């Protein structure tokens, strides 16, 4: 569905300007509620907390077809120099700053010590800080040629603890979806920092579910004190 179709369906479902009591929204309010419904729905889908679906990020074909258009791949070889880490062999990499959740995260290694295995792809294991001390020396869950520990730190950074030098850092995350903005908003206004029209980038399959959730949010907004 397009922005015009989004607005028209929103009005039709809300029974705007009908004879019965009803609710009429501005295009800014329609955009706000559509964006809120979109982001709520995709977060609930990713966490598997939607009772209707009850499935996780890629647990079935339906959810794949829903959130296929947020999956973005990223590559980086630059390392942030001045930072204080929890180990000597700690390197820091920037995050793209539009990430929502990291779903695939792997690290290529370039070191002489692992001879004839150079350029080995290594599995970045997100490790909590409780386990870090007892995982540094762990030969089965600690850093090694086939495994790297990533700890999240401030300023959108990723502290990669490896026994070998880390050359490249690969990611595949869920991106910020573009907001659903149905009209070029006036000066000052914006949704997610976007002022112009913005079409939903997901598939049309989930557009109608987003519309239903946005409508429900609208009625909740108008009918939370009565």
């Amino acid at each position: 569905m397009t922005n015009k179709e989004f607005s028209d369906g929103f009005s039709t479902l809300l029974n705007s300007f009908g004879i019965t009591p009803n609710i009429t929204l501005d295009e800014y309010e329609k955009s706000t509620f559509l964006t809120n419904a979109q982001e709520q729905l995709i977060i609930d889908i990713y966490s598997g907390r939607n009772i209707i679906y009850g499935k996780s990020f890629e647990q079935t074909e339906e959810i794949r077809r829903y959130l296929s258009n947020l999956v973005e791949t990223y590559e980086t070889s630059t390392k942030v120099t001045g930072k204080l880490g929890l180990s000597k062999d700690s390197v820091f990499f920037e995050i793209p700053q539009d990430t929502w959740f990291i779903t695939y995260e792997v690290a290529f290694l370039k070191d002489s010590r692992l001879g004839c295995l150079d350029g080995i792809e290594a599995s970045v294991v997100p490790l909590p800080q409780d386990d870090l001390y007892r995982a540094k020396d762990n030969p089965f869950r600690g850093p090694s040629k086939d495994r790297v520990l990533r700890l999240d730190i401030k300023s959108d950074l990723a502290e990669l603890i490896s026994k070998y030098n880390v050359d490249k850092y690969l990611m595949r995350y869920i991106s910020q979806p573009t907001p659903i903005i149905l009209v070029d908003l006036p000066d000052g206004l914006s949704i997610n920092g976007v002022s112009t029209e913005s079409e939903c980038e997901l598939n049309p399959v989930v557009h109608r579910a987003i519309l239903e959730r946005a409508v429900q949010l609208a009625i909740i907004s108008k009918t939370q004190l009565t």
Partner: protein, 238 residues
């Protein structure tokens, strides 16, 4: 009840039986009062709240027979004779018949079948055109009155890609006046509604007695001539 009897029983009920007889009325005065009573009774009986029963045009057999001899079916003429400015870019202008008192049924015959015309109010127009679709329901059409000169001009709004072939209006004809005698005179021709000749009551004989009674009441109210009578019997003009 032809007009000679209208005058004769008007005299009988007005002054011939009074104890202190009032001056007899001229034939022009009787014609004017009878025509006024005719219009007053038509408006009384068309609207339910205008009469004591609370019954309108088709709320009882009597009202049906009352307006039976006044109903007429005519067609609206497409007003492409001259240009004009319609309030709606997609409305076709049609001119209603001249002798139109009240509209009770309208219909339009399109290529996509016949459709009932729903006269939408100025508030319903604003409500409906604020919606995305802005077209009538399946088997109906909308109507709003436009710039009218010498006769009611009408805008018909149908669904897109529909061409109007006929536009029939079932309306209540304007009653002809009740004139007892030829009002032609050497001192000046007077008219009731632009006609001086004898004019019979062209309505069903069922309401002729009511017209006569209302005429007598108007005559006596005029005879008294105080403000109280005029305002009290002016409430029933309606």
């Amino acid at each position: 009840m032809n007009v000679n009897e209208f005058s004769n029983e008007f005299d009988v009920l007005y002054n011939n039986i009074m104890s202190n007889a009032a001056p007899g009325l001229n034939e022009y005065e009787k014609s004017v009062l009878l025509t006024k009573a005719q219009e007053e009774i038509v408006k009384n009986y068309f609207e339910p709240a205008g009469n004591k029963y609370g019954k309108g045009l088709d709320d009882s057999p009597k009202r049906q027979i009352d307006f039976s001899e006044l109903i007429k079916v005519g067609e609206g003429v497409l007003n492409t004779s001259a240009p004009t400015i319609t309030f709606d870019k997609r409305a076709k202008v049609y001119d209603l018949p001249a002798d139109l008192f009240l509209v009770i049924n309208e219909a339009v015959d399109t290529n996509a079948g016949t459709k009932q015309i729903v006269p939408i109010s100025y508030s319903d127009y604003t409500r409906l055109m604020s919606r995305p679709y802005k077209e009538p329901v399946k088997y109906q059409a909308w109507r709003i009155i436009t710039t009218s000169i010498n006769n009611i001009s009408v805008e018909l709004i149908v669904n897109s890609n529909e061409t109007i072939t006929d536009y029939k209006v079932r309306y209540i004809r304007r009653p002809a006046p009740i004139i007892t005698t030829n009002l032609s005179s050497e001192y000046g021709d007077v008219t009731i509604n632009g006609v001086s000749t004898v004019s019979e009551c062209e309505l069903n004989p069922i309401i002729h007695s009511e017209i006569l009674q209302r005429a007598v009441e108007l005559a006596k109210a005029a005879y008294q001539g105080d403000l109280q009578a005029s305002v009290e019997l002016g409430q029933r003009s309606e």
